[PDB]
Amino acid sequence: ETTALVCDNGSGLVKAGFAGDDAPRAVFPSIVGRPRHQGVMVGMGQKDSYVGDEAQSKRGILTLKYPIEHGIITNWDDMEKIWHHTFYNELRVAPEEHPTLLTEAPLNPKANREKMTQIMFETFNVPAMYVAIQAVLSLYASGRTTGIVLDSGDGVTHNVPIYEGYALPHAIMRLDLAGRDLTDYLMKILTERGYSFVTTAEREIVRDIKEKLCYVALDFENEMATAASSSSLEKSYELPDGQVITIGNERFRCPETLFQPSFIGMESAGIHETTYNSIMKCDIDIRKDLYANNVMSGGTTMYPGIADRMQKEITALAPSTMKIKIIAPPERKYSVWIGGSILASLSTFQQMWITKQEYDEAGPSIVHRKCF
Amino acid sequence: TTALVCDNGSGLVKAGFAGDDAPRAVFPSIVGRPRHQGVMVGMGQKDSYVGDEAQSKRGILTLKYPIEHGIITNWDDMEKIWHHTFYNELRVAPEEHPTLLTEAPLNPKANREKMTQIMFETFNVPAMYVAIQAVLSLYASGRTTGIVLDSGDGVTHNVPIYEGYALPHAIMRLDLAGRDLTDYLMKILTERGYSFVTTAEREIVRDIKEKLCYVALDFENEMATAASSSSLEKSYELPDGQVITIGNERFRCPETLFQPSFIGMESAGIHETTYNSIMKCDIDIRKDLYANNVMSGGTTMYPGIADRMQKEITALAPSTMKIKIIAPPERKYSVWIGGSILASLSTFQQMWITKQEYDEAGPSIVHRKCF
Amino acid sequence: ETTALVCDNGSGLVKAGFAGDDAPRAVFPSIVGRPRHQGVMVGMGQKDSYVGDEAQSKRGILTLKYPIEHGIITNWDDMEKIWHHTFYNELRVAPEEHPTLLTEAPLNPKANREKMTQIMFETFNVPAMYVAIQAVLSLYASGRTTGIVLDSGDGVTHNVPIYEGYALPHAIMRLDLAGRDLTD
Amino acid sequence: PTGPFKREELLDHLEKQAKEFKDREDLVPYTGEKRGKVWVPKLNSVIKPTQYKPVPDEEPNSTDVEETLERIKNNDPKLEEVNLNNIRNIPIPTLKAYAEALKENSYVKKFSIVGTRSNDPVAYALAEMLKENKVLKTLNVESNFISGAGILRLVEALPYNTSLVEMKIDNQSQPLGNKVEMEIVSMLEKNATLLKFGYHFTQQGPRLRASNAMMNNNDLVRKRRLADLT
Numbered sequence A: 001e002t003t004a005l006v007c008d009n010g011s012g013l014v015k016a017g018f019a020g021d022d023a024p025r026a027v028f029p030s031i032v033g034r035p036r037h038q039g040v041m042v043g044m045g046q047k048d049s050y051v052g053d054e055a056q057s058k059r060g061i062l063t064l065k066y067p068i069e070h071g072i073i074t075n076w077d078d079m080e081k082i083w084h085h086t087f088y089n090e091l092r093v094a095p096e097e098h099p100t101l102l103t104e105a106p107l108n109p110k111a112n113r114e115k116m117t118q119i120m121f122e123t124f125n126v127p128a129m130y131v132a133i134q135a136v137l138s139l140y141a142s143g144r145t146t147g148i149v150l151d152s153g154d155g156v157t158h159n160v161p162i163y164e165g166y167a168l169p170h171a172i173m174r175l176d177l178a179g180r181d182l183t184d185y186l187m188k189i190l191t192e193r194g195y196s197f198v199t200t201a202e203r204e205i206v207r208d209i210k211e212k213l214c215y216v217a218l219d220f221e222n223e224m225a226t227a228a229s230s231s232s233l234e235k236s237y238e239l240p241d242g243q244v245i246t247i248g249n250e251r252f253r254c255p256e257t258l259f260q261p262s263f264i265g266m267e268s269a270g271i272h273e274t275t276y277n278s279i280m281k282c283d284i285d286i287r288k289d290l291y292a293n294n295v296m297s298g299g300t301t302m303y304p305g306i307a308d309r310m311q312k313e314i315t316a317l318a319p320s321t322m323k324i325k326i327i328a329p330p331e332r333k334y335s336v337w338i339g340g341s342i343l344a345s346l347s348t349f350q351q352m353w354i355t356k357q358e359y360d361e362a363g364p365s366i367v368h369r370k371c372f
Numbered sequence B: 001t002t003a004l005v006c007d008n009g010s011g012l013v014k015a016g017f018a019g020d021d022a023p024r025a026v027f028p029s030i031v032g033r034p035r036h037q038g039v040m041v042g043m044g045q046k047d048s049y050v051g052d053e054a055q056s057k058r059g060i061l062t063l064k065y066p067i068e069h070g071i072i073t074n075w076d077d078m079e080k081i082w083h084h085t086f087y088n089e090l091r092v093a094p095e096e097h098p099t100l101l102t103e104a105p106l107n108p109k110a111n112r113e114k115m116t117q118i119m120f121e122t123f124n125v126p127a128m129y130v131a132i133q134a135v136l137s138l139y140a141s142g143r144t145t146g147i148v149l150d151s152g153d154g155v156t157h158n159v160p161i162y163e164g165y166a167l168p169h170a171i172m173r174l175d176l177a178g179r180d181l182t183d184y185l186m187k188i189l190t191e192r193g194y195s196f197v198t199t200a201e202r203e204i205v206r207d208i209k210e211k212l213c214y215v216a217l218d219f220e221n222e223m224a225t226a227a228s229s230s231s232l233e234k235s236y237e238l239p240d241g242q243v244i245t246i247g248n249e250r251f252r253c254p255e256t257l258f259q260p261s262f263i264g265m266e267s268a269g270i271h272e273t274t275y276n277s278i279m280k281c282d283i284d285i286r287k288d289l290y291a292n293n294v295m296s297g298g299t300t301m302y303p304g305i306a307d308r309m310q311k312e313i314t315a316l317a318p319s320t321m322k323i324k325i326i327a328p329p330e331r332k333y334s335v336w337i338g339g340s341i342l343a344s345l346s347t348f349q350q351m352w353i354t355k356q357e358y359d360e361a362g363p364s365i366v367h368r369k370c371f
Numbered sequence C: 001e002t003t004a005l006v007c008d009n010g011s012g013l014v015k016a017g018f019a020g021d022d023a024p025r026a027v028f029p030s031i032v033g034r035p036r037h038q039g040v041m042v043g044m045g046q047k048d049s050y051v052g053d054e055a056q057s058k059r060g061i062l063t064l065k066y067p068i069e070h071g072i073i074t075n076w077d078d079m080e081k082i083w084h085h086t087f088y089n090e091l092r093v094a095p096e097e098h099p100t101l102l103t104e105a106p107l108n109p110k111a112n113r114e115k116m117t118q119i120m121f122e123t124f125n126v127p128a129m130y131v132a133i134q135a136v137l138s139l140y141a142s143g144r145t146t147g148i149v150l151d152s153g154d155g156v157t158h159n160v161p162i163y164e165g166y167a168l169p170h171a172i173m174r175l176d177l178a179g180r181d182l183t184d
Numbered sequence D: 001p002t003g004p005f006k007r008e009e010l011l012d013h014l015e016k017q018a019k020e021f022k023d024r025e026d027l028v029p030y031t032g033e034k035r036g037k038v039w040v041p042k043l044n045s046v047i048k049p050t051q052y053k054p055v056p057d058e059e060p061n062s063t064d065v066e067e068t069l070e071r072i073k074n075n076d077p078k079l080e081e082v083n084l085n086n087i088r089n090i091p092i093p094t095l096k097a098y099a100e101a102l103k104e105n106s107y108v109k110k111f112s113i114v115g116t117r118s119n120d121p122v123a124y125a126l127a128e129m130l131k132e133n134k135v136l137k138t139l140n141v142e143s144n145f146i147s148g149a150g151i152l153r154l155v156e157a158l159p160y161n162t163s164l165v166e167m168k169i170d171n172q173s174q175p176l177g178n179k180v181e182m183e184i185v186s187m188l189e190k191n192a193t194l195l196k197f198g199y200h201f202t203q204q205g206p207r208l209r210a211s212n213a214m215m216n217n218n219d220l221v222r223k224r225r226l227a228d229l230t
């Protein structure tokens, strides 16, 4: 009778809703805004914060902080604010009569999962809660059992291969390059055309520019030459104060950092090389099945050139007698949540919850013996 | 054969001859055009003014800043500044002299190409080179490793450099410098009852800034001292013989560099941007950066700024670190001085881009030479 | 002089010196570093590549590559750089008048040994060279003749048993798990 | 020296000065002449954002500072919540008086002073207060101008306090500094009572020390909830 809750707390956005649905009810940015130190506006008699859409709407007098940096929860009071907002203000529900499903990226600290269990059981006290790996949920939403998931969000980009339901943790790869780094790089490279975005309120404007106008080139040098030749790749964007800006090659130079990290000074390899290295660290008899089942998930995979570019690069790296298939569904931005709704709806999952009695008896360490 | 060194900044051009110990010509970066107080732009009369002349007849001249926050944005007015610099200040024929120019940190590729194109095609110089300001300052200081704080009239940069290889990803730019400090000092003098809001008074305000201001080591203590006694006050004689008294404005004004909220701007202060710049650099080379904080530019000239920087970096970094701040007395023109040492070397002869190399290769060579 | 050279090129470290001694003269890391950032200061003795202790000291601005992976030489130009450094810069000797002893792990490819012989005879040309198994040398240093040697370094871990000076190649075991894997 | 500033005299002098500097005629004119060799080689729509859903404002904090301070001095049983957030122009001796009065008050459980421009004297006084007060549960000093020394003094007061459970110190105007951060986590490891600490650490070392300390204290809570269950 009790409906289960599915909550996905990424580095940048929170996607929360009810199990059994098709789309999340509440999708809001994972930011906490605090008063600015300029004494311009002191008349707003609040408590001490604004969270979510309210912080974004009032961002002209606020300083915005992200509670999660590179997939790791760094501030826990702000995380409590986010969870309180998504329980009482967005979903409009009382947490004491709904089980909760939470998500976590691979190769995270154990303390993060332990404190998630502790906060969900001692402050927002739920009958049961369960923590799951995001790539397993993405594979659940994709409908298949074997595949390698490239999950790229706002803080991390990780590759996880799974064969017939068994995961290989020694081949799990993690790269600290995601959407926020691309936003910072776009802020850096818009200064070449004379536009100056500095403050955190303008970072959201640059993020909107990136979400609306950027794309991944199939060949980088040819598209750079084409942009240098003619102004056919140039697009115009209207700022909130009515100013109009024009951008050219910056549309495709920004996501190219995902394939050439040295643009921002990182020594690592691109996502295609990382995926190929993750495939090569597995056993020889499963690589063929991983080749045909490259699954893309996350909001950073939403550029309209990335599947063809990934296919071209991986086909260049892999032997010529292999079928390389990139699986990029249109609803892949919320695949983790969709998988969570799938997982929370199974009749065979209802005995795997962690009840409050078990948490009382064992403490905040049963999350390793119960959750993968 | 004598080389020229031209250091074009946001507020001041410094230009002179390689081998000299100081720039021979120092003058503001202001193109001044006739206004519409009477009739339109008169034909035949000088259609623009640079430097001192533009800072004299200011009342009837719209003043412009061709370089904005260290980046050249008005190429016509830049070429104007350059023509005037060669012909009317140094009084040389440019085609007889190699000319060394400076550029801002993270200057776009196309700007370097356009600078090169203008130097070869308009002025027909025999050779030229473009060096990065901060790098020149560290060169002048005698080191190959450090983090430069370069703060002039329009822009402040932190540029970390290690063993000849600068680090583009870790450079920090803050749009807070001398002009903002002049505006703030003007505001708080107006607050005290000295309303220096005319363009005429601006000079006086700049002079007060350069002569009487200083950075307090502990700001709030200094404010308490200034409120509790007259012991920190100074008199200043105005050009008309009037004498004014100023108090806590001496140290409130440059405090803005450390606390930018005084002028509204919600950016980190130069100590925080210095620390953040160091923290973007790899764990191994960090220690060296800490030991070689080199200050360059006129806005680092305030007495007491070194001790204050030492204190803030000291308390912001792990205790085990050896913190050292290097502040040469001649740092006001250190960039130019670096250029003076640069061209004067026997080894520099083969480093120039020659006219023939340009005529064969085109714009490309500027990047495809010494990068 | 004809005082033989002993050089041990492992996966992680190079130990080179003169025969008849007690300890190696030159022990330095087997890495080649190349710059990854943009150079702005001209001259100052900048090198396009760095080898050994100089690469380790300046590692904050370099990318470091190991020429040997799991006891197998993967890059040969970097290996030539390492051998040139250990002959001319560290040992301060001219290779054409000194015989050289080199080491190799068991169950390695034949092409590695062939190209080592070719490089030592055609580029750093020595009067003579000899390649030996590392575990036999470990048993030589222990002073005894019978024993089973477990040699684990930076790339390989191999067991070789020897009884009265006779080796048993069918019982030689090799595991590609060593110090670098533990570092990872 | 010369009495009150006479602005008109200065302006007249400056204008006289400007009148007397006419421009010089030695300028070589800019004609745009190219003296070197010219090198020869061999549907649009403006998408505007509208995510700003304008959720309304609130009402300015109506708390009467004098009246509230009087109630805290009188030890008023009806006064449990004191919220002085975003009130303009509260004097530093008034905040110090609040901190002195809270020492013996038996009834205020929540106290916050967000965005009141509080500095180090205020933090020092609050620190002294925390060694003596036995009832206060929540202390929020976010978004002020308190330096590392004030925060250090605050956390140095913690082992003499067994009643406070939340301390929010985040979004100060200046970073606290790595050394201070080390002494803070060191003190946090010497208190078993604090359950939430609001601060974005920079170094991962203290970050993890703090995280373990808070998890430890919460587990002490869990274990005593388990032991008291007969």
Ligand SMILES: Nc1ncnc2c1ncn2[C@@H]1O[C@H](COP(=O)(O)OP(=O)(O)O)[C@@H](O)[C@H]1O
Pocket (backbone or CB within 6 Å): A009, A010, A011, A012, A013, A014, A030, A152, A153, A154, A155, A179, A180, A207, A210, A211, A212, A298, A299, A300, A301, A302, A303, A333, A334
């Ligand atoms: N259409 C788009 N194109 C490119 N990037 C996008 C697009 N939509 C969202 N993003 C990026 O996806 C990131 C977050 O995606 P998601 O993975 O759903 O959230 P989280 O990372 O919080 O889990 C944001 O930082 C945003 O920049």
Ligand SMILES: Nc1ncnc2c1ncn2[C@@H]1O[C@H](COP(=O)(O)OP(=O)(O)O)[C@@H](O)[C@H]1O
Pocket (backbone or CB within 6 Å): B008, B009, B010, B011, B012, B013, B151, B152, B153, B154, B155, B178, B179, B206, B209, B210, B211, B297, B298, B299, B301, B302, B332, B333
């Ligand atoms: N003694 C001083 N005290 C304070 N400020 C000074 C002093 N001397 C110069 N300045 C400021 O420094 C500026 C000159 O800096 P400059 O050398 O032109 O830097 P850049 O050209 O690199 O921007 C002037 O605008 C002036 O306001």
Ligand SMILES: Nc1ncnc2c1ncn2[C@@H]1O[C@H](COP(=O)(O)OP(=O)(O)O)[C@@H](O)[C@H]1O
Pocket (backbone or CB within 6 Å): C009, C010, C011, C012, C013, C014, C152, C153, C154, C155, C179, C180
């Ligand atoms: N004190 C130590 N404890 C553990 N491991 C060590 C120690 N000293 C060296 N090592 C490891 O030994 C490895 C190399 O040892 P060695 O066999 O002498 O070199 P190589 O493998 O190149 O022949 C290094 O990877 C290093 O990690």
Ligand SMILES: [Mg+2]
Pocket (backbone or CB within 6 Å): A009, A010, A011, A134, A153, A298, A336
């Ligand atoms: Mg995610």
Ligand SMILES: [Mg+2]
Pocket (backbone or CB within 6 Å): B007, B008, B009, B133, B152, B335
């Ligand atoms: Mg300059």
Ligand SMILES: [Mg+2]
Pocket (backbone or CB within 6 Å): C010, C011, C134, C152, C153, C154
């Ligand atoms: Mg060995």
